[PDB]
Design a binder for these strands. Structure first.
Ligand SMILES: [Ca+2]
Ligand SMILES: [Ca+2]
Ligand SMILES: [Ca+2]
Ligand SMILES: [Ca+2]
Ligand SMILES: [Zn+2]
Ligand SMILES: [Zn+2]
Lengths: 535, 535
DNA sequence: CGGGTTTTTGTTAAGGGCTGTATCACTGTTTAAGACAGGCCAGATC
DNA sequence: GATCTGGCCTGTCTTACACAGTGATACAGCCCTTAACAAAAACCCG
DNA sequence: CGGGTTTTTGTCTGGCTTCACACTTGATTTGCATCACTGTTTAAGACAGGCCAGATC
DNA sequence: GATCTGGCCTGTCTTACACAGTGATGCAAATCAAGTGTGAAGCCAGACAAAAACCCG
């Protein structure tokens, strides 16, 4: 309810004095019940012990700088940052859902008194937010950016009998209140030095606990958990940055296969994922070393635009959210270009196209009340992307064979969108999946011919991904929509709301508070209560 | 507690599902319990009727523009503004404090069923809070201002037999939560045409209900109320604006006596109070008409600086908040001067000035943790005006006697501060009240002799009001602290909060929501629920 | 008026468990509008 | 050409222009109990 | 070890009890959806020509 | 002289950067409000007779 302590105390004492009873509990009984829900409360132990990681079990909110050298002699740093220790936070996230683990265990007809090697599958994701500053006073202070690194327990399995059974699977994976916060920093997500300064310890802890087993007493008996991390909720820019690629405008487009934007137009769907992390460390080594004594423009070809040391280990994936938003903006542009009738007379001016845009947006907020937006958002993408939109915009272009072509294009795009928009297209839409190959090869066909005034050279990133990589990503990892960044893209509102209503402005405590409240919010032993009206 | 409706409903359904009972009430129950506490619910009857005011009794929140013609052909107005009708507001206030004034008659050994002509004494306060905007997106561009005209039932008094007994007196007169809001608008306080367009109807209503008697059934038996309005919650700026006086930096300084700054410095404390509202209207008539055919520079002597038509009827009084802030800032200036020994070597340059300022700032921050600031608030003025602060700053002057010449000065200013700052100096500090004349006269001598290097010509306005008019404003009104703008100055907080936490962004509903919620917050039938824990 | 009784009450101090409220460290990071007085140029004028 | 006078420009001044609200910590009451000893009306009993 | 002493149960037929509960039908409350409205661009970075300007044969 | 080439200038094109939350309406479902006599689930009757948990020769 985003109440504060003074307001909760007002309500407490008022209900108490009126009713006579004590319906709400006092504040200290909330601090005590809170100590149980943060990390740093339960006893756990690793085996073998974690290399370079402490052994204590009461480690709460650590300073994020990790003892970063802060004097007037080292590289200047003022980015305040708080975090959890990865292992203790993961333990807390598991004993926050002990009850659901046990319930799923019973549901799968398993002996509730079991302690097998529970294989957890976590999905971690960082996403830098912008302009988290405010106006606490008479002044427009400054642009202030933040970065949240967060994770989520995606799926818990056990190796019972001779197989694996889902003891637990996240209901809505990319939701604002199942993405647990792990690190909060106030820094530009492209300030590579400070970013690595903050995130290096977390990657260290992650690499450490990737190779051991966690003993944790869970409701009586102790259980042994094994972890498998999957960094997937990184948007395209953060993938190209952390993994050590060149910026998005390069010749090398796909962060999953090493193909060049040009040759990605002569051949649209015959690629295969070949951009791992080990290979990219190897390619950076070849770059920095240059053992074949090549020129810059030959060494680039040798190492496929890798000119930086891969920092975090991500996995090849496509970010369904930004994939769909980019496709929608792309279609907005193609609608404008169809209005301009460019397929017959090219090379208009830098204002004829603006007039075409005016035509389009007037017609749209006259035939749909679809208000124009200068920043493409998923809402405008859902509203735009319909067969009704070509149904409308057909009456703005003179020829009708363009109606036919664009109608067919929209048909194929909507016929394939669910396969990467769902959260389990193996069962939710298996016909679309088993026909994706054909329904996208013909989409590429019709992009080759009836739009070659655009797709002769440059074909954008997300179209290449959407067309050529989706089926094998599915055959590799189940779905595409679940493994996305929508979860970490919602919590910006929570960040701002907590920093406004529940904080202490001290610039040192003021971040512990946000981190703590967002942790509590995304808890589950509490959502069990706030969802009590569903019996 | 400032809950939304979604949040309140969430808490409601949670408690209902957990407990199983129903402690909180559904939203519709609260809307029904709200329709009773807003104005435009009870029946009332003016006798004789109110000239130019309707007779309906169910008029609540209405467009503040009062049907101001808004076409392309009229003077363009764009200010959103909501208001209550003044009589409806007073009726709701009275049948809100019904229980309290019944208890008052009980305590005063009167009859519950007594229907004497209750004379009410209401305070009027209008304050133009500024910068009430927030950044919705990107761009700090537009600052927007606001104005809230409000009132406060200050005392209620029945004329039992042949004596007036105080059935009710406000405990905290200038408090956050008894200043009932009446009208509020988004417009500069000095956009004089808009301000008059909005406040002309309200003035019409408060002029209508000055020769009538509200008949209102209160706890069964009907009662006859009869009003006295006093406009006092006005900062110097609006006083001068809506009385038809020259801007505050003129030669005619006091809004109570018509005297020149030079003559104020020659004669420090012997003035009377000789500037009413009818006198202002009559002097404006002299101005506009110019009956004696004389040039501007002696006509302005004839009309003592009245060159505009008076708009509202305010009373001759001094604010207290701005009074002590101004006097404290003037002592701060005297300190910056004494550090530099301006008396020995006058006419320095505009670098030693800032040097003196930074000297005093660093010194005070070192000695008292009194971190300096630019906008001098009330906490700064509170801390700075202490005998300890002069005892500290006294260690920065090479002189031997300026020590005592500041010690005595601060001594007398402190002997004077309670006299006006008190909400009833008669029975809180009558010794200060009977010595105030002597203390102010000695203070005046001290400024005139050991500080003539500053107060030879210019003497600021507040060192005229404070010095020469307090011992008569007291004898005319009682206190000075009660009749002040603090109650309104505080409510500004609430506005901003409401405007972001309880509103509809509709730019038409988004203001009546703020106004309704502020009326509720200011109610009393609810404050004696949120104060149940004490009693 | 008493006067044995009830019938209930007043009191002590240590230590703890609990609860309610006050206190604490801390965060804003220059005004804008108008009045008047010089002072110096700048042009009107003898 | 010399001189008298007004206009413009800065420059000082005087009124305003958003700090109470956040979580955490610290006291200050305040009741429960040991065990006994004494104390206001409540009231028949004499 | 299997046999024996606790807690704990079945157990009496009677009369008792509170209270759910039959069976309408409209006047209320309560739940859960809708609804109209709000924000009013880019900012770094890659690649490509193209023009010009200075170098070189 | 004549041309080549390299540097700077825009000029497009790529990924990215803030919309669910406000108070209001408005129908569907629930309940509930009486009627009046029912039976049903326990209550408890002091005292008596077949089982689980553990002592005991
Ligand atoms: Ca991002
Ligand atoms: Ca994001
Ligand atoms: Ca003001
Ligand atoms: Ca104010
Ligand atoms: Zn690819
Ligand atoms: Zn005066």
């Amino acid at each position: 309810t985003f109440l504060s302590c003074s307001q909760y105390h007002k309500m407490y004492r008022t209900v108490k004095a009126i009713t006579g009873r004590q319906i709400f509990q006092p504040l200290h009984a909330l601090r005590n019940a809170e100590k149980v829900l943060l990390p740093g409360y339960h006893p756990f132990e690793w085996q073998p012990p974690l290399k370079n990681v402490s052994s204590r079990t009461d480690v709460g909110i650590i300073d994020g700088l990790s003892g970063l050298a802060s004097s007037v002699d080292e590289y200047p740093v003022d980015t305040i940052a708080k975090r959890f220790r990865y292992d203790s936070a993961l333990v807390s996230a598991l004993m926050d859902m002990e009850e659901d683990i046990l319930e799923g265990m019973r549901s799968q007809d398993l002996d509730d008194y079991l302690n097998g090697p529970f294989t957890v599958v976590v999905k971690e994701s960082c996403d830098g937010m912008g302009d988290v500053s405010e106006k606490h006073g008479s002044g427009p202070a400054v642009p202030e950016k933040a970065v949240r690194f967060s994770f989520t327990v995606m799926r818990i399995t056990i190796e019972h009998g001779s197989q694996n059974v889902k003891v637990f699977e996240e209901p809505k994976p990319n939701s604002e209140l199942c993405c647990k916060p792990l690190c909060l920093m106030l820094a530009d997500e492209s300030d590579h030095e400070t970013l690595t300064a903050i995130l290096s310890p977390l990657i260290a802890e992650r690499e450490a606990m990737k190779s051991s087993e966690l003993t944790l007493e869970m409701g009586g008996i102790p259980r042994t958990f094994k972890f498998i991390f999957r960094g997937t909720g990184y948007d395209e820019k953060l993938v190209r940055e952390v993994e050590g690629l060149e910026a998005s405008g390069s010749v090398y487009i796909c962060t999953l296969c090493d193909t060049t934007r040009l040759e990605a137009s002569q051949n649209l769907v015959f690629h295969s994922i070949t951009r791992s992390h080990a290979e990219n460390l190897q390619r950076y080594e070849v770059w920095r070393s240059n053992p074949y004594h090549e020129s810059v423009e030959e060494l680039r070809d040798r190492v496929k635009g890798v000119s930086a040391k891969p920092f975090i280990e991500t996995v090849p994936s496509i970010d369904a959210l930004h994939c769909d938003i980019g496709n929608a903006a792309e279609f907005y542009k193609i609608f404008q270009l169809e209005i301009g009738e460019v397929y017959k007379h090219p090379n208009a001016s830098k204002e004829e196209r603006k007039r075409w845009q005016a035509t389009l947006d007037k017609h749209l907020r006259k035939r749909m009340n679809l208000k124009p937006i200068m920043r493409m958002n998923g809402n405008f993408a859902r509203k735009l992307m319909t067969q009704e939109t070509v149904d409308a915009v057909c009456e703005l272009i003179p020829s009708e064979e363009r109606h036919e072509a664009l109608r067919e294009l929209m048909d194929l795009y909507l016929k394939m969108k669910p396969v990467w928009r769902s959260s389990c297209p193996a069962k939710e839409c298996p016909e679309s999946l088993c026909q994706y190959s054909f329904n996208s090869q013909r989409f590429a066909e019709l992009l080759s011919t009836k739009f070659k005034y655009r797709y002769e050279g440059k074909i954008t990133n997300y179209f290449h991904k959407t067309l050529a990589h989706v089926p094998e990503i599915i055959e590799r990892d189940g779905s595409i929509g679940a493994w996305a960044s929508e979860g970490n893209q919602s919590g910006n509102k929570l960040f701002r709301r907590f920093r406004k209503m529940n904080a202490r402005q001290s610039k040192c405590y003021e971040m512990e508070d946000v981190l703590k409240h967002h942790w509590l919010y995304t808890s589950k032993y509490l959502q069990k209560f706030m969802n009590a009206h569903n019996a």
